[PDB]
Amino acid sequence: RLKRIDRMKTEFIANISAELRTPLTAIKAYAETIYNSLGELDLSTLKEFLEVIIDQSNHLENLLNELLDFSRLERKSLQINREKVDLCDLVESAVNAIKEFASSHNVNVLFESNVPCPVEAYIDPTRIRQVLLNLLNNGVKYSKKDAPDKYVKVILDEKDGGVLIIVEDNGIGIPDHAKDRIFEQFYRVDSSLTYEVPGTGLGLAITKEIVELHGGRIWVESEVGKGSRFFVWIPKD
Amino acid sequence: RLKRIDRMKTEFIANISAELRTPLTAIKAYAETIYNSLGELDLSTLKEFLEVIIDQSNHLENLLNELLDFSRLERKSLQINREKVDLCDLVESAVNAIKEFASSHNVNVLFESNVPCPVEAYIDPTRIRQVLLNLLNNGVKYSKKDAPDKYVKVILDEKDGGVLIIVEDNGIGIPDHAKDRIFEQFYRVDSSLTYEVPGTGLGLAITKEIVELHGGRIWVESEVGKGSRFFVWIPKD
Amino acid sequence: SKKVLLVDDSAVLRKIVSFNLKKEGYEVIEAENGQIALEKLSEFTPDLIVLAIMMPVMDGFTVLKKLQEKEEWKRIPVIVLTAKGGEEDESLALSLGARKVMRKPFSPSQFIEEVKHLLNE
Amino acid sequence: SKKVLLVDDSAVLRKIVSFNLKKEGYEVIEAENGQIALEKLSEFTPDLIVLAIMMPVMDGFTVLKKLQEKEEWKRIPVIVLTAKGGEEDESLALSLGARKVMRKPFSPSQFIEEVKHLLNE
Ligand SMILES: Nc1ncnc2c1ncn2[C@@H]1O[C@H](COP(=O)(O)OP(=O)(O)O)[C@@H](O)[C@H]1O
Ligand SMILES: Nc1ncnc2c1ncn2[C@@H]1O[C@H](COP(=O)(O)OP(=O)(O)O)[C@@H](O)[C@H]1O
């Protein structure tokens, strides 16, 4: 079988190291600074520095969870458990979850429904939230570098006997040769507009697997320099 | 050709997640405790809880440096830069660096030179230190579970035109089929005596590559239930 | 005071969980593996057991199983606090009699809310 | 006071380095990316530049190169503080005229020792 090249696994291992090293650097710097500065530290600053440690720990945890979820999907032990969820709350909730990260990159996050709410669906809310956060996160990560009107927008709709979620951005966009590869495990577009962006290339492979476990599909449309639209279709019941 | 199986790569990803999750658990629990207990912590406890954060951070950093070094060995970018080093001093330094870890597992760490000291040699001291730390760490990790006389011993000697380092333990030992595979990337013995021990299966692959880069070799002798001897032979000049 | 048996192989982990349980006024008895834990039940009966899974000598799953096989041990409620992140891991623990499975990394304040809930019914 | 130009794309990182520099009485000017850093040199001449590598818009290797291309800018000492952990990364930065490369994660107290050394000699 032609498959995930050893070159891609090696890059992957390097990329793990790099993405984890940034929060770890903050954890250690903030902790040592507290320890050595307990006399020069006011209470408000002590608390602020502890909050940074905690929040960087949480980011690191999320990154570890990505690795865990990917190993669990590759072994097929990850198995869905559905419920009746209002997609409108779920999306708003996901949008709230990513607010701080989007601000940190000056990206506005929007939500529109083409259909009135609630929008009920028989889905695993945990795993669909995680699909939405991967797409929302990617819309922030791959946003334009220096632009005044950067956004990521979730569009909710009902189509073809299911729910259609579109995540649209005006980011860097994706080259045509990359488009058919972006869902593959470990695949990252390597360009002058992505060299600094941390990642493993697992997120969209996880997302694809979760969506297909729900009997749904995910596809992409993009233009380089303009932006991207990710479409997720999942059956209504 | 026949290579590093995909099941092994999946296990590896799962193992990364697990080994990193333990220090991260301590970082976040200790940080949140401090943040939520500032009225309930005396100063020596505050400082002790900060030192935990810092020391757990340092362990996580070592585990990232393993992934990094491994990626860099797989790309030939890892240069060795030799120098005249007293190995007696290097070994004592490595023995010191592991003492706390060995104590946490009730493992005594010993050093004997079969030859008078100094034992000078032309080696990269950072890379050899790291070889010694990987072997010492493994002697602790794979030590017996409940025994009053657990040890890891470094024996230094000069032989066949080079320096011979033996790391001996009275641990769990290695079964015969496993012996030909323990140096392979991602390989861990999976048994009822290893299930709780964290690791990636990269350490002896890194160690073997570093040793070959010095023009040396590494081999093992072991008996299940008795223990193991790792032999590292590197040319003196 | 309520008595909690804390079973985990990490001294670092036991220390922080013990600190948080003592903030509430609970007494704490520590065991570093599952066999040690079962041996300590010969000296006392805890109001709650906090139990890790991945321990040398005797793992948590074995502990939960042995707890169900004695009448005097079977009624003690157990919170499993574990890095074992799977749904199947959790289902196994609950089917072995655990009252609650909480994952690591954990929130100390969430953990203590759950402890209180189990101790107060 | 000595003035330090702090160049890094992480606000979290800038904050902790800034705190530790201001503990020593230094003034700190911050820059989010390499291009911003070079623009702020029209306003002042720092005594030291603390520089990351992986930044959008303009990376630290381009920054180091552009710093050597102007006589005014070329004698400002630069400590590179970076996650780039390779020997070949370090050699490249030193060949581009950095004075010192320190790896991340770093010790704040070791970093400050090196800052003081460079600011005095
Ligand atoms: N919204 C987007 N805009 C541009 N490129 C993107 C977008 N989302 C994903 N990509 C590309 O798809 C690749 C795979 O994405 P993902 O699997 O989420 O991995 P990662 O984000 O860790 O690289 C990314 O590296 C990036 O090149
Ligand atoms: N001293 C030892 N005694 C017993 N087994 C060992 C010893 N050192 C190494 N091993 C075995 O060799 C395997 C490979 O070791 P290593 O490459 O260091 O990886 P890791 O320690 O992450 O598993 C370990 O999983 C273990 O089964």
Residue numbers in the entry:
A (entry chain A), B (entry chain B): 243 to 479
C (entry chain D), D (entry chain C): 2 to 122
Question: What are the paper's exact sentences on this?
Answer:
TCS are composed of two main players, a sensor protein called histidine kinase (HK) and an effector protein called response regulator (RR). The HK catalytic core is comprised of an ATP-binding domain (CA domain) and a phosphoacceptor domain containing the phosphorylatable His residue (DHp domain). RR activity is controlled by the phosphorylation of a conserved Asp residue located at the N-terminal receiver domain (REC domain). Thus, we have explored the relation between the effect of the pH and His rotamer-dependent phosphorylation from a functional and structural perspective solving the structure of several HK853–RR468 complexes at different pHs.
In order to confirm that the sulfate ion was indeed stabilized in that position thanks to the presence of the phosphorylatable His in a gauche− rotamer, we generated mutants of HK853 and RR468 defective in its phosphorylatable residues H260A and D53A, respectively, and obtained the structures of its complex (HK853H260A–RR468D53A) at pH 5.3 and 7.5. The overall structures of the complexes were similar to the HK–RRpHs but the absence of the imidazole group due to mutation of His to Ala was concomitant with absence of sulfate ion bound, supporting that the presence of the His was required to coordinate the sulfate. A second sulfate ion bound to the catalytic site of RR468 was also observed, despite absence of phosphorylatable Asp due to its mutation to Ala. The presence of sulfate ions at the active center of RRs lacking the phosphorylatable Asp has been previously reported for MaeR triggering its phosphorylated conformation.
